[PDB]
DNA sequence: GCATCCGTGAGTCGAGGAAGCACAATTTAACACTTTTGTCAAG
DNA sequence: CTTGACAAAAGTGTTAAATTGTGCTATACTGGGAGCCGTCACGGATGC
């Protein structure tokens, strides 16, 4: 079957053991001598499979005949060695270990279910405090001990073993207390030592024993290696032992009868216990635990009266019960797993739901968070105790290989070292437990085992990272393998390295057609090698494919017919050319290769702008689509000649450029003379006669009788363009001379160059009548006029004729720029004579500013501002003087022509070359008082050059630090919008948006018509939601708006006939998981309605992010866009009115306050003194209308005005940044991203549903839920619109595969696993990860099942059946 | 409300690759021999 | 198709090296060692 969904869930110890083919019991990897895997180790063949196909370890089975067999000698299955990549083992832990993901991922899942703080969980898990599981009637400091109570180590010891203390008596002294006498706190035991607790006092080591013989206080000395064998106050018959020793020579016995008295204790032991004397055998033993009433000895004659630990003292023949309780308190994951197994999720949910009615919001907020985790376990079917590991899975050995390098050295992965540590510690703990080691040692081993598991799963998350000894590089754990820019997702699943790919330097191919590229022969030989081998065999070049491959291995073995065969292999095929960074989809284009000699790829000039490529050393990659589908898609969808318009704005993107523009501008610009320039005559005979006398120039404007003409128009009248260009060939007239020509039945007055341009377009499109309508004859052909020509040709003729026109424009532009005579010399940077006059004026005004400043008429700051204004004004005047000189005296100056035509440079750069450099800014942001008064032609001074370097470095640093921000933003946009596709023709919605044609300019306090570019960016290629009647023209509902329609609407607005246009937009589309054809509009790249199955989400992200690097960075620029897409609260946020009413300013010397007064309401706003109010007294302000200047908080705007208002604000404010930079971007692309930001709602009233108040879900889901509920007469859910940024919107998506591959992988995976989330594979990222066909383009269900059949077969099938 | 803390994020290709010994237990190697296998000429 | 010599071609069985695993030292010894350090954003969680 086909995979349709991917589910993630917790694995139980039972399931982990079902995966494993065996337990890894030893940390041995391979044998150091034979290099074979060690038995029971991390590379065992008996577990993970054979190392070579169909061959066991012992070498008894060596063929596939014994397939599925297991050798009895070695136990290795006889099968394929590839199973060694898929077969898992496991490690059986001596004690449970918590999974760090469900502990350290804030908020922890284990803590939330158990109601334990982050610190409390850590203290228990890492053996710092005990947690009570059974108090057993234990009292701690007069208070009963309760379950789930945390005990410190001292508290546990006091409760479990009691209170006791040893006081060392000074040598020689004798204690004031006897052995076995009860003491009270503060009592003095010895002359200088006082006890601190009440209990039985016991002599530890009596140094002197004083017996009393009866006939006599004989004494004996006690040494450390001796022990007394009798209790105090004992009658000893002559002969009985008294003090024992290692050597019987020093052993002490009693000569006669007496009473033994012990004196001089080494120390005093105070123990809180009850002493029970006995005579017969005791029924208990040391270490036993007893309760009140339990029999101790003498058949019930002596019984316990208190809880404690029973210890029998045979020397004193008494039973001591050290008062203590048998409390059950545990540390580590064994205790936590005990609590997690005892949880009743049914009971917990009921209690949480009851607490969901608490008046406090914090209590309900906490209850909702707990119940969301509880609900996840209840719904998914997972068990909370599965978050603690009893068996640890072991990765297949081939994914953590230990390989021998070409030099014989061994390389291994970090996972083997992490596995060995866990196995070594696990084995050691088992040995310690078998030895009955003390609790201190066991606790250290268990704490180390927990840490070893943590390092294996997520190294460095908790504590110091584990490093391999001899280095400080942290070991790479399982979490590091999956997360980050170098993880599995982004490095191996979302992108890959591919076969049939090449690379080389790119050079310009001017002779190529738009759809052609120059592919080196030696690159194409390797790229198409499998195809070439087949063709070589098909011909007689080689006998078979293997012989052909040997021929190609040696360069000197390649014959000349191999190149003929290669030419046949590539016939008709295309290749993909790729340049990094791929900012938009035009960074990959398909071309038909032309095999060329050399080693560099030839690139067509007209596609360089789309690739952002130049020829300073750039490189491109080459890719070969292999199947018929890949070749068809590349030739139809990705061919360069088919993508001529911009998907972002719909304007031409393959169009005339630097040299092409210059050559076409040069011929279409007319000459202007000054010799005559005014003389008036009576007849043309006189006017021409003066021309022969030299009094008037050919192109000097004159007036013959009443009309203004020139000599050329009167002297040279040509019957047709061919005659005019024949005269140009003979040198009679120039291309720039204005003469009279007869063309298309009209007696035009133009230059031969403009008539030549008209013929160029006419022949390219092969239509003289249509060509005449496409061009503007009476202007020089600059970048904008040539861009309009391409767009109009595309509309009227299509891709094929437009690509031909682009090829003809490129050819003639190149040809005419070579012979025109364009060059740059030092004298071409003409210095206006007005610069000297302006600088002298600035010196006088500056000297006058200093004079006033000396007189005190102004301060330092106003002196500083006035200086900057003076030099800012002078720079503008010098710029104007520079360009006024060019257009009057040097209209054909190379710098003027390049800037005027759009080929190169702008007025700012020309001023620095010809005028003055201007003012420079300090590193701190201030501007130097003294400007750079020299241009580049004159040459800066050393100090001026250094001062100018401050800004140059700052610009370079801004550019470097701006690429990372723009690239990061694009990735956020792609991940939030990647699932949006055009999925149907129409969603049936009746909603729409009104695009405003007028903008409320506040300075003039009135409405003013918006700019054409702004209106076009919001109207072009959009479906009219309602019928519109303007200027006698009826634009019916459902009509796509072309540029002509948009211009008609702008003309209607100019006449006061329409203020806004109702259109369909992605904001109001009702399609699920995408938009419909009617809500999107045109495919701006083709100027026609978008086709179903297009990934408009990806296009929108690339359109927005591509010009991201052109946004200034230095609340403005790219930072402004990033904040708007993240829905961040501005620091200097404006103040808006929550309700509508009249403003009443109460400004006072004490404070500033603004009052919005209504019929009954009076809202008060305390604004700061430095507040730039934009509303004065007596103004009727509506809800959400700003009162103070600044950026509006989108979340405050959403609450006050609504979803529509915030959506309009976000689109307009984002477009302002791009417009300020000259970038043209359709509103559709922003509205698609904004539609994703506003995709969620918050539950406020659950109604008759299981939703929790404050729960965040998708708007589509709640709407579907509400309609279902209403269908059955149940109260619907009341929700609240929600706004979130692109980052948060992408992470809260319903597909965990796409969210896990974005960022926050541990958090995404931990929540998905607990909930048992199932991924339906809806968007593009999920299908790319699994290598499936994406549900867009040719992979969309709308077009995927189309069938093609010819007439003959169709008739046979219909005939053969009917 | 609020600071303060921690945790996660920050463009793309390319090119650069320090015991020592004793002894027991286990494994490996080298014989030995018999037992297939592969040829041979026939027949 | 056999039919008997033949000869390596291989395997089975001891034996002895060669390798590997393991236990044991008796003056008295009793709590570690390396960072050190120029960024900025955000949530989100808690200390209350
Ligand atoms: C009008 C004329 C044919 C008219 C007829 O058949 N009689 C056609 C036939 C071949 C055409 C030229 C070539 O393509 C090369 C080149 C292609 C560039 O794109 C534009 C310039 C060039 C020089 C073209 C100009 C023009 O277009 C020509 C002369
Ligand atoms: Mg370059
Ligand atoms: Mg004439
Ligand atoms: Zn085997
Ligand atoms: Zn729609």
JSON list of N, CA, C and O in Angstrom, two decimals, chain A residues 100 182 282 312 341 517 553 576 631 803 1016 1024 1069 1083-1084 1094 1104 1189 1211:
[
{"chain": "A", "resi": 100, "resn": "UNK", "atom": "N", "xyz": [15.02, 12.71, 29.09]},
{"chain": "A", "resi": 100, "resn": "UNK", "atom": "CA", "xyz": [15.31, 14.11, 29.38]},
{"chain": "A", "resi": 100, "resn": "UNK", "atom": "C", "xyz": [14.39, 15.05, 28.62]},
{"chain": "A", "resi": 100, "resn": "UNK", "atom": "O", "xyz": [14.15, 16.18, 29.05]},
{"chain": "A", "resi": 182, "resn": "UNK", "atom": "N", "xyz": [19.56, 7.06, 81.06]},
{"chain": "A", "resi": 182, "resn": "UNK", "atom": "CA", "xyz": [18.89, 8.03, 80.22]},
{"chain": "A", "resi": 182, "resn": "UNK", "atom": "C", "xyz": [19.36, 9.44, 80.55]},
{"chain": "A", "resi": 182, "resn": "UNK", "atom": "O", "xyz": [19.54, 9.79, 81.72]},
{"chain": "A", "resi": 282, "resn": "UNK", "atom": "N", "xyz": [15.99, -14.05, 72.52]},
{"chain": "A", "resi": 282, "resn": "UNK", "atom": "CA", "xyz": [15.23, -12.97, 71.91]},
{"chain": "A", "resi": 282, "resn": "UNK", "atom": "C", "xyz": [14.64, -13.47, 70.60]},
{"chain": "A", "resi": 282, "resn": "UNK", "atom": "O", "xyz": [15.29, -14.22, 69.87]},
{"chain": "A", "resi": 312, "resn": "UNK", "atom": "N", "xyz": [20.20, -6.01, 69.02]},
{"chain": "A", "resi": 312, "resn": "UNK", "atom": "CA", "xyz": [20.40, -6.82, 70.22]},
{"chain": "A", "resi": 312, "resn": "UNK", "atom": "C", "xyz": [21.84, -6.67, 70.67]},
{"chain": "A", "resi": 312, "resn": "UNK", "atom": "O", "xyz": [22.78, -6.90, 69.90]},
{"chain": "A", "resi": 341, "resn": "UNK", "atom": "N", "xyz": [2.78, 5.67, 37.53]},
{"chain": "A", "resi": 341, "resn": "UNK", "atom": "CA", "xyz": [1.95, 4.48, 37.39]},
{"chain": "A", "resi": 341, "resn": "UNK", "atom": "C", "xyz": [0.69, 4.58, 38.23]},
{"chain": "A", "resi": 341, "resn": "UNK", "atom": "O", "xyz": [-0.34, 3.98, 37.89]},
{"chain": "A", "resi": 517, "resn": "UNK", "atom": "N", "xyz": [21.83, 27.93, -23.77]},
{"chain": "A", "resi": 517, "resn": "UNK", "atom": "CA", "xyz": [23.02, 28.18, -22.97]},
{"chain": "A", "resi": 517, "resn": "UNK", "atom": "C", "xyz": [24.20, 27.50, -23.63]},
{"chain": "A", "resi": 517, "resn": "UNK", "atom": "O", "xyz": [24.04, 26.64, -24.50]},
{"chain": "A", "resi": 553, "resn": "UNK", "atom": "N", "xyz": [37.14, 6.49, -20.01]},
{"chain": "A", "resi": 553, "resn": "UNK", "atom": "CA", "xyz": [37.95, 6.66, -18.80]},
{"chain": "A", "resi": 553, "resn": "UNK", "atom": "C", "xyz": [39.25, 7.39, -19.10]},
{"chain": "A", "resi": 553, "resn": "UNK", "atom": "O", "xyz": [39.66, 8.28, -18.34]},
{"chain": "A", "resi": 576, "resn": "UNK", "atom": "N", "xyz": [19.08, 22.42, -16.22]},
{"chain": "A", "resi": 576, "resn": "UNK", "atom": "CA", "xyz": [18.78, 23.45, -15.24]},
{"chain": "A", "resi": 576, "resn": "UNK", "atom": "C", "xyz": [20.07, 24.17, -14.86]},
{"chain": "A", "resi": 576, "resn": "UNK", "atom": "O", "xyz": [21.07, 23.52, -14.52]},
{"chain": "A", "resi": 631, "resn": "UNK", "atom": "N", "xyz": [11.79, 16.24, -17.97]},
{"chain": "A", "resi": 631, "resn": "UNK", "atom": "CA", "xyz": [12.12, 17.01, -19.17]},
{"chain": "A", "resi": 631, "resn": "UNK", "atom": "C", "xyz": [10.92, 17.82, -19.66]},
{"chain": "A", "resi": 631, "resn": "UNK", "atom": "O", "xyz": [11.08, 18.94, -20.14]},
{"chain": "A", "resi": 803, "resn": "UNK", "atom": "N", "xyz": [9.74, 36.73, -26.99]},
{"chain": "A", "resi": 803, "resn": "UNK", "atom": "CA", "xyz": [11.11, 36.26, -26.88]},
{"chain": "A", "resi": 803, "resn": "UNK", "atom": "C", "xyz": [11.91, 36.61, -28.13]},
{"chain": "A", "resi": 803, "resn": "UNK", "atom": "O", "xyz": [13.11, 36.91, -28.05]},
{"chain": "A", "resi": 1016, "resn": "UNK", "atom": "N", "xyz": [-1.89, 50.03, -8.62]},
{"chain": "A", "resi": 1016, "resn": "UNK", "atom": "CA", "xyz": [-1.64, 48.86, -9.46]},
{"chain": "A", "resi": 1016, "resn": "UNK", "atom": "C", "xyz": [-1.23, 47.66, -8.62]},
{"chain": "A", "resi": 1016, "resn": "UNK", "atom": "O", "xyz": [-1.63, 46.53, -8.92]},
{"chain": "A", "resi": 1024, "resn": "UNK", "atom": "N", "xyz": [-13.07, 41.16, -9.69]},
{"chain": "A", "resi": 1024, "resn": "UNK", "atom": "CA", "xyz": [-14.03, 42.07, -9.09]},
{"chain": "A", "resi": 1024, "resn": "UNK", "atom": "C", "xyz": [-15.08, 41.29, -8.32]},
{"chain": "A", "resi": 1024, "resn": "UNK", "atom": "O", "xyz": [-15.75, 40.41, -8.87]},
{"chain": "A", "resi": 1069, "resn": "UNK", "atom": "N", "xyz": [-10.74, 34.41, 1.22]},
{"chain": "A", "resi": 1069, "resn": "UNK", "atom": "CA", "xyz": [-10.98, 33.10, 0.63]},
{"chain": "A", "resi": 1069, "resn": "UNK", "atom": "C", "xyz": [-11.40, 32.09, 1.69]},
{"chain": "A", "resi": 1069, "resn": "UNK", "atom": "O", "xyz": [-10.89, 32.10, 2.81]},
{"chain": "A", "resi": 1083, "resn": "UNK", "atom": "N", "xyz": [-1.87, 34.72, -12.37]},
{"chain": "A", "resi": 1083, "resn": "UNK", "atom": "CA", "xyz": [-0.46, 34.35, -12.27]},
{"chain": "A", "resi": 1083, "resn": "UNK", "atom": "C", "xyz": [0.32, 35.51, -12.86]},
{"chain": "A", "resi": 1083, "resn": "UNK", "atom": "O", "xyz": [0.41, 35.65, -14.08]},
{"chain": "A", "resi": 1084, "resn": "UNK", "atom": "N", "xyz": [0.90, 36.35, -12.00]},
{"chain": "A", "resi": 1084, "resn": "UNK", "atom": "CA", "xyz": [1.53, 37.58, -12.48]},
{"chain": "A", "resi": 1084, "resn": "UNK", "atom": "C", "xyz": [2.65, 37.30, -13.47]},
{"chain": "A", "resi": 1084, "resn": "UNK", "atom": "O", "xyz": [3.01, 38.19, -14.25]},
{"chain": "A", "resi": 1094, "resn": "UNK", "atom": "N", "xyz": [-1.07, 25.63, -8.34]},
{"chain": "A", "resi": 1094, "resn": "UNK", "atom": "CA", "xyz": [0.14, 26.42, -8.18]},
{"chain": "A", "resi": 1094, "resn": "UNK", "atom": "C", "xyz": [0.43, 26.67, -6.71]},
{"chain": "A", "resi": 1094, "resn": "UNK", "atom": "O", "xyz": [-0.47, 26.99, -5.93]},
{"chain": "A", "resi": 1104, "resn": "UNK", "atom": "N", "xyz": [8.34, 38.19, -1.33]},
{"chain": "A", "resi": 1104, "resn": "UNK", "atom": "CA", "xyz": [8.57, 39.11, -0.22]},
{"chain": "A", "resi": 1104, "resn": "UNK", "atom": "C", "xyz": [10.04, 39.15, 0.16]},
{"chain": "A", "resi": 1104, "resn": "UNK", "atom": "O", "xyz": [10.62, 40.23, 0.35]},
{"chain": "A", "resi": 1189, "resn": "UNK", "atom": "N", "xyz": [1.61, 59.91, 17.52]},
{"chain": "A", "resi": 1189, "resn": "UNK", "atom": "CA", "xyz": [2.41, 59.36, 16.44]},
{"chain": "A", "resi": 1189, "resn": "UNK", "atom": "C", "xyz": [3.21, 58.16, 16.92]},
{"chain": "A", "resi": 1189, "resn": "UNK", "atom": "O", "xyz": [3.57, 58.05, 18.09]},
{"chain": "A", "resi": 1211, "resn": "UNK", "atom": "N", "xyz": [-0.85, 44.94, 5.92]},
{"chain": "A", "resi": 1211, "resn": "UNK", "atom": "CA", "xyz": [-0.50, 44.95, 4.50]},
{"chain": "A", "resi": 1211, "resn": "UNK", "atom": "C", "xyz": [0.00, 46.33, 4.09]},
{"chain": "A", "resi": 1211, "resn": "UNK", "atom": "O", "xyz": [1.01, 46.46, 3.39]}
]
